[PDB]
Design an enzyme around this catalytic site. Structure first.
Site, PDB file in Angstrom:
ATOM      1  N   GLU A 293      -5.566  -7.828   5.448  1.00  0.00           N
ATOM      2  CA  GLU A 293      -5.614  -7.242   6.773  1.00  0.00           C
ATOM      3  C   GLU A 293      -6.473  -5.996   6.773  1.00  0.00           C
ATOM      4  O   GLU A 293      -6.019  -4.911   6.418  1.00  0.00           O
ATOM      5  CB  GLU A 293      -4.218  -6.875   7.279  1.00  0.00           C
ATOM      6  CG  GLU A 293      -4.227  -6.467   8.757  1.00  0.00           C
ATOM      7  CD  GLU A 293      -3.229  -5.366   9.099  1.00  0.00           C
ATOM      8  OE1 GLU A 293      -2.302  -5.641   9.892  1.00  0.00           O
ATOM      9  OE2 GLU A 293      -3.370  -4.231   8.584  1.00  0.00           O
TER      10      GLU A 293
ATOM     11  N   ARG B 127      -8.217   5.729   1.585  1.00  0.00           N
ATOM     12  CA  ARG B 127      -7.554   4.988   0.519  1.00  0.00           C
ATOM     13  C   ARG B 127      -6.562   5.830  -0.280  1.00  0.00           C
ATOM     14  O   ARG B 127      -5.556   5.302  -0.729  1.00  0.00           O
ATOM     15  CB  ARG B 127      -8.596   4.431  -0.460  1.00  0.00           C
ATOM     16  CG  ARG B 127      -9.078   3.037  -0.154  1.00  0.00           C
ATOM     17  CD  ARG B 127     -10.222   3.077   0.829  1.00  0.00           C
ATOM     18  NE  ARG B 127     -10.818   1.760   1.015  1.00  0.00           N
ATOM     19  CZ  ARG B 127     -12.081   1.471   0.726  1.00  0.00           C
ATOM     20  NH1 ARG B 127     -12.883   2.409   0.235  1.00  0.00           N
ATOM     21  NH2 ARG B 127     -12.542   0.250   0.932  1.00  0.00           N
TER      22      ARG B 127
ATOM     23  N   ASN C 159       0.817  -1.204   0.000  1.00  0.00           N
ATOM     24  CA  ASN C 159       0.000   0.000   0.000  1.00  0.00           C
ATOM     25  C   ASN C 159       0.854   1.260   0.000  1.00  0.00           C
ATOM     26  O   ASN C 159       0.422   2.318  -0.458  1.00  0.00           O
ATOM     27  CB  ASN C 159      -0.895   0.028   1.235  1.00  0.00           C
ATOM     28  CG  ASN C 159      -1.541   1.391   1.458  1.00  0.00           C
ATOM     29  OD1 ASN C 159      -2.476   1.757   0.751  1.00  0.00           O
ATOM     30  ND2 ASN C 159      -1.046   2.147   2.442  1.00  0.00           N
TER      31      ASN C 159
ATOM     32  N   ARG D 135      -4.558 -18.752  13.085  1.00  0.00           N
ATOM     33  CA  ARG D 135      -3.174 -18.325  13.035  1.00  0.00           C
ATOM     34  C   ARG D 135      -2.658 -18.149  14.449  1.00  0.00           C
ATOM     35  O   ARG D 135      -3.253 -17.419  15.243  1.00  0.00           O
ATOM     36  CB  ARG D 135      -3.024 -16.996  12.289  1.00  0.00           C
ATOM     37  CG  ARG D 135      -1.595 -16.476  12.294  1.00  0.00           C
ATOM     38  CD  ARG D 135      -1.467 -15.122  11.609  1.00  0.00           C
ATOM     39  NE  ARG D 135      -2.221 -14.098  12.321  1.00  0.00           N
ATOM     40  CZ  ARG D 135      -2.407 -12.858  11.874  1.00  0.00           C
ATOM     41  NH1 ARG D 135      -1.894 -12.481  10.715  1.00  0.00           N
ATOM     42  NH2 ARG D 135      -3.128 -11.995  12.577  1.00  0.00           N
TER      43      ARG D 135
ATOM     44  N   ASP E 287      -1.022  -6.378   3.825  1.00  0.00           N
ATOM     45  CA  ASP E 287      -0.943  -5.358   4.851  1.00  0.00           C
ATOM     46  C   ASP E 287      -1.748  -4.112   4.467  1.00  0.00           C
ATOM     47  O   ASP E 287      -1.807  -3.729   3.301  1.00  0.00           O
ATOM     48  CB  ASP E 287       0.534  -4.997   5.064  1.00  0.00           C
ATOM     49  CG  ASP E 287       0.725  -3.805   5.988  1.00  0.00           C
ATOM     50  OD1 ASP E 287       0.415  -3.923   7.187  1.00  0.00           O
ATOM     51  OD2 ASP E 287       1.194  -2.751   5.516  1.00  0.00           O
TER      52      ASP E 287
HETATM   53 CA   LIG Z   1      -3.653   3.853  -0.132  1.00  0.00          CA
END
Ligand SMILES: [Ca+2]
Ligand SMILES: *[C@@H]1O[C@H](CO)[C@@H](O)[C@H](O)[C@H]1NC(C)=O
Length: 496
Positions: free
Chosen positions: A233, A158, A100, A337, A197
């Protein structure tokens, strides 16, 4: 994307947080394979910023400088070696993919990276990729500071920088291809899947576009047509415009409500009790089981760095932690997990740990090797929760009861509950401030079973508590609220 790609029989993966590649390869052969572990989640294998203030914190690994397999965990050769050796023994490798963003926009330019790669955050220059100012969405973000300021605005969440982290323009084919090139390199090496992530900070459609450029798993270890296991995630505790269900078309999602609610229940906060766990799962508002990635704690929230808050149980609360992990591993909901951490000097100043940045055990920046003590525990400050008998044995418990339905539930209306998994397993818990002594229906075949929490089945004998099941499946359970481990678990493979 929804199947873990683990060997039939393995139902859990362990996060070996900050472990070196050579140590993981050894662990795969000497312990994970024989104890029935399905796979390992590794720390980001790509070059990151070397931060000396504070001194090499764990979060420096979430600030990429390039996609070279060069980190404190080892180099590409060691990484490849680890995947081969682990795969050759049936233990899969899942990579923590930081796609990201790059490093913080305020980081100093130069070669302060784990592989000496040059980078200039100020001019958005990352030549080792390469990336330039056109590859970030500084011009797309509409906030005054350029950072995310309001999570009620799904757009800035975002398109803007998460706490200053340079945000990649994932809508650009060039950027999508550079990320895919990195992931396909890992896939062809042998990895079985990825942990995406900060998925909440990426558009579901941008992720899809990237996943569409990925290869199938290496045909040398996996069946043709095998797709990488994908778990995103996404921290969705409700109340935000972004929902984890928006990412269902890409793969699984981390269910952060799982560990948070389990913590408050086990801790008995807000008047909550274990008897309420009767309809645990979707009935509690969690995502569908076939799309869930569950855990008790993660590297983030175990140090107050993630969603969950103060209710999250960690190795620090050993007794309650073992009970929570045990309930998780016995319950049919989602894919589990297990967390494996290291010890740091916790130091609560004002209800806050000012040492939550401390990185892995090291010698002047060099990560310490994981040493195994005679009792199988770990040294050099590694906690190795996955090696605790109570946890290791519950991992096997999940494997043995895999597929069995949830039945024979019992509760005292308080914190004394029990349930079984078909006719392959049964677990009992005592979280009340008094003793438990009662004959319960187990749905298990008659015989003598070894309690896998207090002991082990060794040489046709039990080293701990023994349970006797009669012809009608009934058995007596006695658990004092003073027991080191207030719960008992028995299964088909612990029978004498
Ligand atoms: Ca972003
Ligand atoms: C169980 O252990 C005892 C010794 O502690 C012995 O009487 C018996 O033979 C053992 N059973 C097996 C199968 O070893």
């Amino acid at each position: 994307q929804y199947s873990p790609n683990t060997q039939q029989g393995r139902t859990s993966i362990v996060h070996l947080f900050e472990w070196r590649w050579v140590d993981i390869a050894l662990e795969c052969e000497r312990y994970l394979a024989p104890k029935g572990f399905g796979g390992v989640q590794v720390s980001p294998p790509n070059e990151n910023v070397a931060i000396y203030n504070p001194f090499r914190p764990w979060w420096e690994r979430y600030q990429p400088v390039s996609y070279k397999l060069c980190t404190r965990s080892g180099n590409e050769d060691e990484f490849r070696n680890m995947v081969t050796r682990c795969n050759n023994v049936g233990v899969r490798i899942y990579v923590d993919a930081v796609i990201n963003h790059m490093c913080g926009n305020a980081v100093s330019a130069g070669t302060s990276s784990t592989c000496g790669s040059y980078f200039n955050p100020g001019s958005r220059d990352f030549p080792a990729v390469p990336y330039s100012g056109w590859d970030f969405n500084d011009g797309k973000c509409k906030t005054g500071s350029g950072d995310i300021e309001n999570y009620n605005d799904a757009t800035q969440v975002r398109d803007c920088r998460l706490t200053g982290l340079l945000d990649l323009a994932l809508e650009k084919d060039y950027v999508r291809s550079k990320i895919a090139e990195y992931m396909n390199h890992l896939i062809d090496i042998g990895v079985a899947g990825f942990a995406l992530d900060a998925s909440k900070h990426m558009w579901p459609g941008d992720i899809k576009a990237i996943l569409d450029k990925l290869h199938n798993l290496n045909s040398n270890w996996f069946p043709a047509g095998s797709k990488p296991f994908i778990y995103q995630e996404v921290i969705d505790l409700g109340g935000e415009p972004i929902k984890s269900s928006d990412y269902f078309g890409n793969g699984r999602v981390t269910e952060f409500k799982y560990g948070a609610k389990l913590g408050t229940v086990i801790r008995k906060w807000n008047g909550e009790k274990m008897s309420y766990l009767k309809n645990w799962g979707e009935g509690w508002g969690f995502v569908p089981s076939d799309r869930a990635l569950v855990f008790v704690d993660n590297h983030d929230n175990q140090r107050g760095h993630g969603a969950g808050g103060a209710s999250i149980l960690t190795f620090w609360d050993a007794r309650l932690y073992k009970m929570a992990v045990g309930f998780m591993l016995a319950h049919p909901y989602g894919f589990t997990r297990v967390m494996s951490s290291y010890r740091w000097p916790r130091q609560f100043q004002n209800g806050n740990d000012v040492n939550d940045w401390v990185g892995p055990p090291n010698n002047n920046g060099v990560i310490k090797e994981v040493t195994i003590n005679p009792d199988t525990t770990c040294g050099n400050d590694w906690v190795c929760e996955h090696r605790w008998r109570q946890i290791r044995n519950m991992v096997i418990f999940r494997n043995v009861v895999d597929g069995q339905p949830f039945t024979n539930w019992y509760d005292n209306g308080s914190n004394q509950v029990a349930f079984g998994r078909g006719n392959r397993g049964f677990i009992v818990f005592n979280n009340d401030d008094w003793s438990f002594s009662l004959t319960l229906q187990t749905g298990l075949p008659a015989g003598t079973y070894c309690d896998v929490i207090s002991g082990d089945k060794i040489n046709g004998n039990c080293t701990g508590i023994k349970i006797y099941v009669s012809d009608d499946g009934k058995a007596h359970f006695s658990i004092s609220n003073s027991a080191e481990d207030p719960f008992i678990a028995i299964h088909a493979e612990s029978k004498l």
